[PDB]
Amino acid sequence: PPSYVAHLASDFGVRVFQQVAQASKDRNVVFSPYGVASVLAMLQLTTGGETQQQIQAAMGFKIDDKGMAPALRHLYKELMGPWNKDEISTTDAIFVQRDLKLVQGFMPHFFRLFRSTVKQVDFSEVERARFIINDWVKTHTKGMISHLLGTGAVQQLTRLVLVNALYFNGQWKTPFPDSSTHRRLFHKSDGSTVSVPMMAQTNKFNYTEFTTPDGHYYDILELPYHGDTLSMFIAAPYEKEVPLSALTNILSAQLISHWKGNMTRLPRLLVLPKFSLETEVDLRKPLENLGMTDMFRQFQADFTSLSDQEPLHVALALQKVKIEVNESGTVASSSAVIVSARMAPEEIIIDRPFLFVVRHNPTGTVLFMGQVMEP
Ligand SMILES: [Cl-]
């Protein structure tokens, strides 16, 4: 089902973000809970045996089950509809050795389910294979993501690669002014500060203070995008010794929903750092920690649904996310005569590390999720 599978998909991907985050420590990290959910669902089809059970358990749904793929493909068409003014461009690709004898009916079946095809390449032509892979991403992310560092691992022994790449760029329901954007010190998690550019805006924001069962307090602010189709939620720790990991490690779609129910509109002056960050992840370590170890093993991996004669296994599972946040009419050239604005009761300055979550409002899909430590 629709919002059902979107939630199983989002939750799984967040579970994947927790792993990437517990590894990144104090590095800025952008990730797409949706992306890794979309691709892993496709890979379910190329698996069999234990390698398949480990993934359907990790994700929480069999891709061949009634309404799973139909709901998933309906979702994709929704995100890529006409409202999306090139705000989010994505691409999911599975590259297998072309010389490999495939199972009778895998390609036809895969297409019917995803309306996409598994890519074939002759991995013996290393240079060609890598170019072909970094090129697919390019042409299919509207030229936003044209390279990968991980492809540098594709060699002769490679027979299978998984790739996922997303690009996201706002377009707020109410653009942050421009003349208001200014310099402001940001408190990095070590007492050190840096003069970073921040956007400012007074208006009626949807806010809520949030406490985790653990007792951590966060200022939660929802920031809508044009048409309320998307919303970027901001979870900024209360004091200063409050980590992001206290929230991100208990995060789910039901938690975002929770914020919405307790949310209220207060007239504040929001000061938000403008950030354009990029992260590339080697999904292997994080996927293994979620219980998916077999797929990465030379003798254990079981992809007999993609081909039954083979010593296969994913040689490279990765993701690349490019997130940008600005005024949306961002001249950005380092600042005329006047600047006016309506006054607000209080201000909410985001000058310390914080985490954000972008969601598809109609379905509550957790599209993007990050931890911004130093903009
Ligand atoms: Cl790139």
UniProtKB/Swiss-Prot annotation:
Expressed in endothelial cells. Found in plasma, platelets, and hepatoma and fibrosarcoma cells. The keyword Glycoprotein applies. Keywords: Glycoprotein, Protease inhibitor, Secreted, Serine protease inhibitor, Signal. It is found in: Secreted. Gene3D superfamilies: Alpha-1-antitrypsin, domain 1 (2.30.39.10), Antithrombin, subunit I, domain 2 (3.30.497.10). GO terms for cellular component: collagen-containing extracellular matrix; extracellular exosome; extracellular region; extracellular space; peptidase inhibitor complex; plasma membrane; platelet alpha granule lumen; serine protease inhibitor complex. GO terms for molecular function: protease binding; serine-type endopeptidase inhibitor activity; signaling receptor binding. Glycans are attached at residues 206, 262, 326. Induction: Up-regulated by coagulation factor Xa (F10) in atrial tissues. Up-regulated in atrial tissues by rapid pacing resembling atrial fibrillation. Changing residue 171 to C: Increased half-life of the active form. InterPro entries: Serpin_CS (IPR023795), Serpin_dom (IPR023796), Serpin_fam (IPR000215), Serpin_sf (IPR036186), Serpin_sf_1 (IPR042178), Serpin_sf_2 (IPR042185). Pfam families: Serpin. GO terms for biological process: angiogenesis; cellular response to lipopolysaccharide; defense response to Gram-negative bacterium; dentinogenesis; fibrinolysis; negative regulation of blood coagulation; negative regulation of cell adhesion mediated by integrin; negative regulation of cell migration. Inactivated by proteolytic attack of the urokinase-type (u-PA) and the tissue-type (TPA), cleaving the 369-Arg-|-Met-370 bond. CDD domains: serpinE1_PAI-1. The record marks 342-343 as: Reactive bond. Serine protease inhibitor. Inhibits TMPRSS7. Is a primary inhibitor of tissue-type plasminogen activator (PLAT) and urokinase-type plasminogen activator (PLAU). As PLAT inhibitor, it is required for fibrinolysis down-regulation and is responsible for the controlled degradation of blood clots. As PLAU inhibitor, it is involved in the regulation of cell adhesion and spreading. Acts as a regulator of cell migration, independently of its role as protease inhibitor. It is required for stimulation of keratinocyte migration during cutaneous injury repair. It is linked to Plasminogen activator inhibitor-1 deficiency: A hematologic disorder characterized by increased bleeding after trauma, injury, or surgery. Affected females have menorrhagia. The bleeding defect is due to increased fibrinolysis of fibrin blood clots due to deficiency of plasminogen activator inhibitor-1, which inhibits tissue and urinary activators of plasminogen. Forms a heterodimer with TMPRSS7. Interacts with VTN. Binds LRP1B; binding is followed by internalization and degradation. Interacts with PPP1CB. In complex with PLAU/uPA, interacts with PLAUR/uPAR. Interacts with SORL1 and LRP1, either alone or in complex with PLAU; these interactions are abolished in the presence of LRPAP1/RAP. The ternary complex composed of PLAUR-PLAU-PAI1 also interacts with SORL1. Interacts with PLAT/tPA. Also interacts with SORL1, when complexed to PLAT/tPA. Belongs to the serpin family. This is Plasminogen activator inhibitor 1. It comes from Homo sapiens (Human). The gene is SERPINE1.
